[PDB]
Amino acid sequence: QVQLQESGGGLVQPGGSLRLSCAASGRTISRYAMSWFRQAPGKEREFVAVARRSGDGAFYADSVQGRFTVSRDDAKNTVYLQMNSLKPEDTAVYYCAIDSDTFYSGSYDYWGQGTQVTVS
Amino acid sequence: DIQMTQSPSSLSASVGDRVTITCRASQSVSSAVAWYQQKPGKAPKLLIYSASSLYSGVPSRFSGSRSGTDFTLTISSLQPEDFATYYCQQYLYYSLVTFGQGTKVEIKRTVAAPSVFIFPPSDSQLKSGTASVVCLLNNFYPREAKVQWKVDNALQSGNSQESVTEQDSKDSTYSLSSTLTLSKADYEKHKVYACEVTHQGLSSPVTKSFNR
Amino acid sequence: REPFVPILKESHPLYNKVRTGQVPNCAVPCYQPSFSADERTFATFWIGLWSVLCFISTSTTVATFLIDMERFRYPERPIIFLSACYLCVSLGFLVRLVVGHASVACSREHNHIHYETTGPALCTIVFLLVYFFGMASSIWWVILSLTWFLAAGMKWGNEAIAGYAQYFHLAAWLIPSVKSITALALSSVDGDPVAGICYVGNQNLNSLRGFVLGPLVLYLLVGTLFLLAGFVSLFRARRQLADLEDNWETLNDNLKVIEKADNAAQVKDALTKMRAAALDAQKATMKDFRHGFDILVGQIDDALKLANEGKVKEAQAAAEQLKTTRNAYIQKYLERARSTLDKLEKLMIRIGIFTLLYTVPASIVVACYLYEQHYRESWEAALTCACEYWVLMLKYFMCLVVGITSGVWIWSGKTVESWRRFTSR
Amino acid sequence: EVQLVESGGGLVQPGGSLRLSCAASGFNVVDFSLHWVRQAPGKGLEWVAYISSSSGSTSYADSVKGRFTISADTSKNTAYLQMNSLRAEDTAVYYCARWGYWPGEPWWKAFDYWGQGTLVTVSSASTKGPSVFPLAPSSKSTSGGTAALGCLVKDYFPEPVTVSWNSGALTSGVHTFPAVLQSSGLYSLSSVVTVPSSSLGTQTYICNVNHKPSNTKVDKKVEPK
């Protein structure tokens, strides 16, 4: 009974920046946690980042830690992945993804259809 | 009688960060609440007494404050010693002392996915009439994983048992182990076993399996 | 622009170094013809109408003080001197209206306006009165705000007001005297069109900064800081009195609830709120008035264990015993705690509203000056070819407003009848 | 300094009775109240009883009313807690704590000088030795990178057991888990090493168990299938 969408795009550049977004639709977020995934050819579905709900923190992967930063807006139900130091080995579609369980089990279901961020 | 609720029940925080642990009294206690540190294995220690006053001996990064009936400990700098459990405890009369739930503070670590290995029953447990399978989840972060036992979609409940280790000494990561115990007769039923696992660092559930 | 005195050089005085309009001698005529001109036909009686009122409302008032021979005292003492200043400030404009614009600041012998310190004393009279009394009035206001803060946040008492005020009243006079005599030695005094007065700043913006732009900001700021500090101290005292009263009533009412209820459970359920409220009131608190709270909480400590141990009427009697210790300490301290704040709130609010009202005109004055400097900046260089009357008439008015407040602040029929019976004889 | 000590821990049958002795060295106990604070394993703290022998003011928590009782002579400067009919929940660790009278500072301080407390358990089944079983990896369980090889110990009592991996020679990611209460009143524990590749080094690894209440020493052998 939900569907989740994202924004952004563009053919970016070696070393660029972006502020990726996923805006919720049909549903609020505040009971869930939201995680930003990736999709690079070679090894898809890989993890990037996760933000919870209660201000208790947010985690990132190894290769993207620090150079990305996840912020969350529960009022507009939109989550922003600040993308800095975009090295060209980050050629990947990006996904917004959502847990069905509030206990952070990672039960992920809904994806959307990607933001196509390719760095040359 | 009165109820003590303590909200940030598990906190992941990096070294040298700033953490706040709150506490809420059900009734209206006056300025009469304390904060304790317990490290695993030893007896607890006093840390804050009479809402905001410091006890003698403890370092001064810790602080306490009161706003009406809502009390709060804050650590401005997360020292690499202060990884333990903090309990909120009111006092009012002698026979009314109640404690909070206690929150655990944890080392921030970069998210890694589990590695999942399924071990069948032994070639000795079959002789004793009780066969147990285990599924080992190794080297991940954070704790919150979901194992699932499906003897060909026979999603068990009550025949499983699970146990994590503590946070690893080196790279700080957990290892969960789930176990299913079964009779001799109920063992060879179906023919396929698999454990299916999810975690927040897993895009898809991982199924590790073997045939009986 | 040609009717801005291009009088021929007489060599000296000033016809070689006034630099007005980027030329040797093109300067200022006596009235203001290029921003309103004929509207001055109104203004010739405009400042007249207020001025007589701003005499009368204070003319009796200091005399009313001389009827009483200091009845009201130190926390209202600088009201008398602040009221006194406006008498002379109005009196200067009275001198203007008894002589006229065309002879007190218009140049008698050289037909522009008066500059500098005149030899035969004329312009210097009204300058001395307006500047000296003006600045001194604002100094009396800011030390009044000092008295307000010392009585509100410190509450040091009228003798402690007296000991500081014996120095500070003679300290106040010095600063306007200092700035007045430095202005007079600098001789930056000059006439002002659509006034007839003798003030400063028409010569240059730097003189305006040197006399009236700076201090009027400064005194206003150091008054407002003390005022807001006193008000936030007042609100802190008000809220702490309110919560101590809350602790008292939830003590007394719940004790009465214990007195007329039964059973072994709700007695402990109420006595725990009693202990909570008593601890909360003891934390606010003097030494006997905290020791009474200590022995009260200890009496509840005596009360509660018998309720734990299955004795109900023993707990009742233990509860009843509190009343005397409530009376002999807690009640008689709550009375003075309430009475002090009530005596402050009923009077010092009535005094501090004079400050609150006063702060607005001073600000509007410095805003009017800050816009008139930009207007003069717009018009001064504007000569040859190429290729807001109400803000003017408002400024002298809002300087005079505070005086008539002393005609309404002193409104009290009792002491007016005291004046009438004293003077009737 | 002042110091506390608890004594009397161990194991009892259900429906038993026991005495715990808290001795205070340094400060005398006429001037300070003793409390008893219980921690069930894997829980928060909870409150039991107190005593304060300036007047004798013994209270109890609601869970222990009708089962627990207390005493505190000040000539021996110590306190005694007697429990009878132990429900199986009451397995825990107990602490003895100090609290000062009203008024003044030592009441405003809460419990400060805690003894380290002792553990008691509602032991229901007789003590015995464990059974040891191999957990060999499959031939299809990662034939290249890491490889997981484990030992399982099951059905033992009481709590402390130790497992040594070749009597000390391995530390490459050795994992040994907390024991869990088996539902039949026993204990079960699991350990695993993640020995990487080379056909598990083709070395017949041995899990050496030690359970001194049963003084057993099984040295089981594990190998891949």
Residue numbers in the entry:
A (entry chain K): 1 to 120
B (entry chain L): 2 to 213
C (entry chain R): 193 to 428, 1001 to 1049, 1063 to 1118, 441 to 486, 499 to 536
D (entry chain H): 4 to 228
What's the publication's text?
Frizzled (Fzd) receptors recognize lipidated and glycosylated growth factors, called Wnts, that play crucial roles in stem cell biology, embryonic development and adult tissue regeneration. Although Fzd receptors are part of the class F G protein-coupled receptor (GPCR) family and involved in G protein signaling, they primarily activate the canonical β-catenin pathway. The overall architecture of Fzd receptors consists of an N-terminal CRD, or ligand-binding domain, that serves as the Wnt binding module, and a seven-transmembrane domain (7TM) that is connected to the CRD by a long hinge region.
In order to deduce insights into the structural basis of Fzd activation, we determined a fiducial-assisted cryo-EM structure at 3.7 Å resolution of hFzd5, lacking any thermostabilizing mutations. We introduced the BRIL domain (cytochrome b562 RIL) fused in place of intracellular loop 3 of hFzd5. We employed an anti-BRIL Fab, BAG2 with an anti-Fab nanobody (Nb) to complex with the BRIL fusion hFzd5 (hFzd5ICL3BRIL). The BRIL/Fab/Nb module was designed as a ‘fiducial’ marker for particle image alignment. The final 3D map was created by combining the two different classes, resulting in a 3.7 Å map of monomeric hFzd5ICL3BRIL/Fab/Nb with substantially better TM features allowing model building. The EM volume is defined for the extracellular loops (ECL) 1–2 and the hinge domain (C192-F227). The hinge region forms an ordered structure that, along with ECLs, occludes the orthosteric ligand binding pocket defined for Smo and class A GPCRs.
